Design a protein around this ligand. Structure first.
Ligand SMILES: *[C@@H]1O[C@H](CO)[C@@H](O[C@@H]2O[C@H](CO)[C@@H](O)[C@H](O)[C@H]2NC(C)=O)[C@H](O)[C@H]1NC(C)=O
Ligand SMILES: *[C@@H]1O[C@H](CO)[C@@H](O[C@@H]2O[C@H](CO)[C@@H](O)[C@H](O)[C@H]2NC(C)=O)[C@H](O)[C@H]1NC(C)=O
Ligand SMILES: *[C@@H]1O[C@H](CO)[C@@H](O[C@@H]2O[C@H](CO)[C@@H](O)[C@H](O)[C@H]2NC(C)=O)[C@H](O)[C@H]1NC(C)=O
Ligand SMILES: *[C@@H]1O[C@H](CO)[C@@H](O[C@@H]2O[C@H](CO)[C@@H](O)[C@H](O)[C@H]2NC(C)=O)[C@H](O)[C@H]1NC(C)=O
Ligand SMILES: *[C@@H]1O[C@H](CO)[C@@H](O[C@@H]2O[C@H](CO)[C@@H](O)[C@H](O)[C@H]2NC(C)=O)[C@H](O)[C@H]1NC(C)=O
Ligand SMILES: *[C@@H]1O[C@H](CO)[C@@H](O)[C@H](O)[C@H]1NC(C)=O
Ligand SMILES: *[C@@H]1O[C@H](CO)[C@@H](O)[C@H](O)[C@H]1NC(C)=O
Ligand SMILES: *[C@@H]1O[C@H](CO)[C@@H](O)[C@H](O)[C@H]1NC(C)=O
Ligand SMILES: *[C@@H]1O[C@H](CO)[C@@H](O)[C@H](O)[C@H]1NC(C)=O
Lengths: 82, 329, 232
């Protein structure tokens, strides 16, 4: 349950305060994945089937934009495909 | 002789993801009103579906305009771009959010209690999926791909290339041989820096430059404001609040007054939803235009005349904005 | 192409097989058609259910009102029912008009895509799919059209030490088509997208003024293709 625009004072450890609202019933993951359910303010919940603990669980992680790249620009270097 | 003139071009990309609830708006949190509203039928499901479709389409517009890059590129620590100064458009790490000098001049001339009144009546405003931080990071990745990798970062894998060599492609693409660039490189860099300074000065003069975003927000705000004021309408009943109709009359005679009030309020809310749908369709057309502009001007070089700004277009630098995007052609 | 024709044909056949396999996996690929049909079907379905609404009247079917009340008192109930049903039908018509305008925009986009991507080769970047566009194959679909954009994607890279121009005897030398690259010792002039190295003759390169004004120029002896011919 996602309580939008609620001060979360009225309706443990299952909460997670997002800028959209506190998501009760989802555990945060500090790793960022590509997200399929859009939630709000960069948060996306998803269903994670893990064979170790909590095979039925919903994780609310910050949205990942993609693989960060560090292309090495040089004033005399070019990259031409072969 | 030639001159390079940076031209700003503003395009709305999305509007506020609003949301309306019947029993909060149509009913003043009463019970008999809820009975009558459920008696009318399934208009509320249609209204909620339409508004959720509007919100989904706005989210898709925002995610399609900006997220045209699979990878988030970064500018190199050194800035040897052949004398070309990009400190104004490149990200500024001073802010906690990786915005830029020109992006900051945009977020201050829009500015997007009345909000509490709308919230208490069920007229909530959902937050966008992409915050200004991730939109700014998408713009920074686009800038890094354009400056360092030229335009091949859109076709396939990004390929590093000297900036003084990248612009040797674009002149040769607009007819002028690259020797003209390679003999007048310092002059071109000076003109480009001067043009960036001039466009920054113009952005730091008046908000009337951003006359499109200040309309995509002011029209939705006015629509919500005039939807709020429809609750202060008699609509034929002897009052305008449903707590002063059930406190005066009895059910068999108060049902007609409540029916009048509910049909009037439902008509007003349906009018608001239709206006919102039409405006969302127009914004979708504008976002498609912005998407193709960023797909052609930024990710390459358009041969279309007067599309990517007047004159033979060389390149573009996408920049974030409040509910929109501005190009620096 | 004329040196790698068989390789390109094999890659194209493999790509067609892969897109066939992807189409034979899930319907989520056709997420647009399954919406242009489902939204209209759902709109018709929710228009049907509005006939089951009292709208204030003491019933919901017009045969159980004229079988209970008399004309002078049944007319008010019928007016209630008719204004409610007309409002619902007008709402459906407005939704259909808005969706038809959106579909008209989509069909204009499809028409221009067929007119440029298929009937030619568009220079527009990322219009006819990601990467450079070779050709497109339109295919029918239920209330729609699917394009199979054949695209040119560079696969593997290799760094080179480039150079904006070349000093020979004080005169600058710029490549008329391609760029100057070096594999460590020598120099070559190659096309931008593909690494096909060629020696720097006087055909691949043109002169423009001296070579002390251009920034970043390097030294090399451009092989004049007439020296062995003028020696004899
Ligand atoms: C092309 O135009 C530029 C811009 O007007 C010229 O650069 C100016 O040159 C004058 C003297 O020729 C200087 O006094 C200015 O300070 C220059 N301005 C800038 C911004 O550099 C350039 O000289 C012109 N080129 C030719 C061949 O006439
Ligand atoms: C690029 O341009 C910016 C701004 O046009 C330059 O920053 C200015 O630098 C001068 C000298 O250091 C300062 O007096 C100004 O206060 C700076 N202004 C701003 C807005 O930062 C920057 O030096 C330029 N860099 C290059 C390499 O040309
Ligand atoms: C370019 O890439 C293609 C596709 O990866 C290569 O074609 C494959 O090459 C390997 C080894 O030569 C063969 O085992 C495969 O059967 C080939 N596949 C196809 C579909 O032809 C090609 O060799 C690469 N060319 C170069 C010069 O690296
Ligand atoms: C760069 O490419 C040139 C191509 O001419 C290489 O020169 C020849 O490379 C072949 C490789 O099979 C050798 O057998 C020849 O002896 C080389 N010289 C000549 C005159 O043909 C060169 O080795 C490559 N690498 C560098 C660092 O220059
Ligand atoms: C490129 O080659 C030329 C010719 O061999 C070198 O000649 C220089 O020319 C400048 C301009 O007149 C003189 O000031 C230098 O004294 C010349 N060099 C010598 C050694 O006499 C030039 O130095 C070479 N440049 C590079 C970057 O390799
Ligand atoms: C939360 O606090 C604010 C400020 O007092 C108040 O306006 C609002 O009604 C409260 N309740 C919410 C958002 O549910
Ligand atoms: C959260 O951060 C901790 C360390 O701060 C890390 O060990 C953990 O893997 C992260 N993710 C969780 C708890 O899902
Ligand atoms: C430009 O390239 C040369 C050659 O490697 C290098 O020495 C120089 O440092 C580069 N320029 C800058 C500003 O680093
Ligand atoms: C090119 O150089 C960069 C940085 O020096 C390196 O990361 C990359 O692997 C190189 N690519 C090739 C093909 O050598």
């Amino acid at each position: 349950v996602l309580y939008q625009d609620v001060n979360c004072t009225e309706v443990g450890s299952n909460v997670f305060q997002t800028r959209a609202g506190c998501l009760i019933g989802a555990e945060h993951v500090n790793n960022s994945y590509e997200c399929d359910i859009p939630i709000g303010a960069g948060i996306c919940a998803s269903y994670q089937t893990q064979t170790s603990v909590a095979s039925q669980s919903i994780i609310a992680y910050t949205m990942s934009l993609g693989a960060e790249n560090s292309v090495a620009y040089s004033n005399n270097s070019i990259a031409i495909p072969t | 002789n030639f001159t390079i003139s940076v031209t700003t071009e503003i395009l709305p990309v999305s509007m506020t993801k609003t949301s309306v609830d019947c029993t909060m708006y149509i009913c003043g949190d009463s019970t008999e009103c809820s009975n009558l509203l459920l008696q009318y039928g399934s208009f509320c499901t249609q209204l909620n579906r339409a508004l959720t479709g509007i919100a989904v389409e706005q989210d898709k517009n925002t995610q399609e305009v900006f997220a045209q890059v699979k990878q988030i590129y970064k500018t190199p620590p050194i800035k040897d771009f052949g004398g070309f100064n990009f400190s104004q458009i490149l990200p500024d790490p001073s802010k906690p959010s990786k915005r830029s000098f020109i992006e900051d001049l945009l977020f201050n001339k829009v500015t997007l209690d009345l909000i509490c009144a709308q919230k208490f009546n069920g007229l909530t405003v959902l937050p966008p999926l992409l915050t200004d931080e991730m939109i700014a990071q998408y713009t920074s990745a686009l800038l890094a791909g354009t400056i360092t990798s030229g335009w091949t970062f859109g076709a396939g894998a990004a390929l590093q290339i000297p900036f003084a060599m990248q612009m040797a492609y674009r002149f040769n693409g607009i007819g002028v041989t690259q020797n003209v660039l390679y003999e007048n490189q310092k002059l071109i860099a000076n003109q480009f820096n001067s043009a960036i300074g001039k466009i920054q000065d113009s952005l730091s003069s008046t908000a009337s430059a951003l006359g499109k975003l200040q309309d995509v927000v002011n029209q939705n705000a006015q629509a919500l404001n005039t939807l709020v004021k429809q609750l202060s309408s008699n609509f034929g009943a002897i009052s305008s609040v449903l707590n002063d109709i059930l406190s005066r009359l009895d059910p068999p005679e108060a049902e007609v007054q409540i029916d009048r009030l509910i049909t009037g309020r439902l008509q007003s809310l349906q009018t608001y939803v239709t206006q919102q749908l039409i405006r969302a369709a127009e914004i979708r057309a504008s976002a498609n235009l912005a998407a193709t502009k960023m797909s052609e001007c930024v990710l390459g070089q358009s041969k279309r005349v007067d599309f990517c700004g007047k004159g033979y277009h060389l390149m573009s630098f996408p920049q974030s904005a409040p509910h929109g995007v501005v190009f620096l052609h | 192409l004329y040196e790698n024709q068989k390789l390109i044909a094999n890659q194209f056949n493999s790509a067609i097989g892969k897109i066939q396999d992807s189409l034979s996996s899930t319907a989520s690929a056709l997420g647009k058609l399954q919406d242009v049909v489902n939204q209209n079907a759902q709109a018709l379905n929710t228009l049907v259910k509005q006939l089951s609404s009292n709208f204030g009247a003491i019933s919901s079917v017009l045969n159980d009102i004229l079988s209970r009340l008399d004309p002078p008192e049944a007319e008010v109930q019928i007016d209630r029912l008719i204004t409610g049903r007309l409002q619902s039908l007008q709402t459906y018509v407005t939704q259909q008009l808005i969706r038809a305008a959106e579909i008209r925009a989509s069909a204009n986009l499809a028409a221009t895509k067929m007119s440029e991507c298929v009937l030619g080769q568009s220079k527009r970047v990322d219009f006819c799919g990601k990467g450079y566009h070779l050709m497109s194959f339109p295919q029918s679909a239920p209330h729609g059209v699917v394009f199979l954009h054949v695209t040119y994607v560079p696969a593997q890279e290799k760094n080179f030490t480039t150079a904006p121009a070349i000093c020979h005897d004080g005169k600058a030398h710029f490549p008329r088509e391609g760029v100057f690259v070096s594999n460590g010792t020598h120099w070559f002039v190659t096309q931008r997208n593909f690494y096909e190295p060629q020696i720097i003759t006087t055909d691949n390169t043109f002169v423009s003024g001296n070579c002390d004004v251009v920034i970043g120029i390097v030294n090399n002896t451009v092989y004049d293709p007439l020296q062995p011919e003028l020696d004899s």
